[PDB]
Design a protein around this motif. Structure first.
Motif, PDB file in Angstrom:
ATOM      1  N   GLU A  13       0.822  -1.208   0.000  1.00 22.94           N
ATOM      2  CA  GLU A  13       0.000   0.000   0.000  1.00 22.94           C
ATOM      3  C   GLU A  13       0.859   1.263   0.000  1.00 22.94           C
ATOM      4  O   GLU A  13       0.597   2.202  -0.761  1.00 22.94           O
ATOM      5  CB  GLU A  13      -0.952   0.008   1.198  1.00 22.94           C
ATOM      6  CG  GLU A  13      -1.727   1.323   1.303  1.00 22.94           C
ATOM      7  CD  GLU A  13      -2.643   1.395   2.519  1.00 22.94           C
ATOM      8  OE1 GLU A  13      -2.596   0.490   3.384  1.00 22.94           O
ATOM      9  OE2 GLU A  13      -3.422   2.365   2.596  1.00 22.94           O
ATOM     10  N   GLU A  14       1.888   1.307   0.852  1.00 20.69           N
ATOM     11  CA  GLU A  14       2.732   2.502   0.912  1.00 20.69           C
ATOM     12  C   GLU A  14       3.450   2.737  -0.409  1.00 20.69           C
ATOM     13  O   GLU A  14       3.537   3.872  -0.898  1.00 20.69           O
ATOM     14  CB  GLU A  14       3.754   2.363   2.042  1.00 20.69           C
ATOM     15  CG  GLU A  14       3.148   2.519   3.428  1.00 20.69           C
ATOM     16  CD  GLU A  14       4.070   2.038   4.529  1.00 20.69           C
ATOM     17  OE1 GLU A  14       5.177   1.528   4.232  1.00 20.69           O
ATOM     18  OE2 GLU A  14       3.675   2.169   5.708  1.00 20.69           O
TER      19      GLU A  14
ATOM     20  N   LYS B 198       0.973   3.981  -3.028  1.00 23.55           N
ATOM     21  CA  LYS B 198       0.614   5.384  -2.850  1.00 23.55           C
ATOM     22  C   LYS B 198       1.721   6.287  -3.374  1.00 23.55           C
ATOM     23  O   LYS B 198       1.452   7.313  -4.015  1.00 23.55           O
ATOM     24  CB  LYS B 198       0.346   5.687  -1.369  1.00 23.55           C
ATOM     25  CG  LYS B 198      -0.985   5.152  -0.859  1.00 23.55           C
ATOM     26  CD  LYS B 198      -1.132   5.449   0.651  1.00 23.55           C
ATOM     27  CE  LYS B 198      -2.543   5.162   1.168  1.00 23.55           C
ATOM     28  NZ  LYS B 198      -2.606   5.308   2.668  1.00 23.55           N
TER      29      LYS B 198
ATOM     30  N   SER C   2       1.621   6.216  -7.157  1.00 25.03           N
ATOM     31  CA  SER C   2       0.490   6.946  -7.716  1.00 25.03           C
ATOM     32  C   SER C   2       0.718   8.445  -7.665  1.00 25.03           C
ATOM     33  O   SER C   2       0.317   9.164  -8.589  1.00 25.03           O
ATOM     34  CB  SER C   2      -0.799   6.598  -6.963  1.00 25.03           C
ATOM     35  OG  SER C   2      -1.027   5.197  -6.989  1.00 25.03           O
TER      36      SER C   2
END
Lengths: 130, 130
Positions: A6-7, A10, A13
């Motif tokens: 997830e990190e 992010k 992105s």
């Protein structure tokens, strides 16, 4: 610093959002900053979603993978759409390289999940070449 | 030049074979060639499975993604195993970047298949850090 899938995604992105803007909404400003007469320049995307045209990083040992260097030098030696496509592919590759640098300690399934998330949006090359 | 998933993956595998050898069987020779007093050096893997320590490519416009630069400068500023790990991660990232540069025209499922093949062997980082 990003460590989980997830990190890292992010971070990917946000950097991609910056480069997307450089190559689309801000394409005229990005193009002008890539002055062929300047020294070698690179297109960077930062995790705060800002893009930057600047000299390559001077870092020892090398930390993040570096973007394609000297993109300004050949700006006017090809059709504008071909130069933009070249910058887009190299930006795609840089974004991927950065994520899997942060992802060095991910296991096999985590690498698969991270790539799946990256592969969920069109590449910058796809966007720019329509 | 590699264009299909099979072609790009053969190119990836040959380059990776070269870098694997540099970081394992030939690690002592690779280490010695990375002289901290020389100018900035990079570790390249070629599709004939040869590895090379050399100055960065001077190419305008940039063609292939470039490997991490100046890896020799910090060779002796960390434990040998940590320097080797850093070179390994950057080599993993370079290999991935090169493949998806050649793969700019692949569609979404082709990108997924290519990454799956790349993700079928341990990374160089995994190999080197045991």
């Amino acid at each position: 610093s990003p460590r989980t899938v997830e990190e890292i995604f992010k971070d990917y992105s946000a950097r991609r959002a910056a480069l997307l803007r450089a190559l689309t909404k801000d394409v005229d400003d990005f193009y002008s900053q890539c002055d062929p007469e300047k020294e070698n320049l690179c297109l960077y995307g930062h995790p705060n979603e800002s893009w930057e045209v600047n000299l390559p990083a001077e870092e020892v040992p090398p930390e993040l993978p570096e973007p394609a260097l000297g993109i300004n030098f050949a700006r006017d030696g090809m059709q504008r759409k071909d130069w933009l496509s070249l910058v887009a592919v190299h930006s795609d590759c840089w974004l991927l390289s950065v994520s899997f640098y942060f992802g060095a300690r991910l296991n096999r399934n985590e690498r698969k999940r991270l790539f799946s998330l990256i592969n969920d949006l069109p590449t910058l090359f796809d966007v720019v070449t329509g």
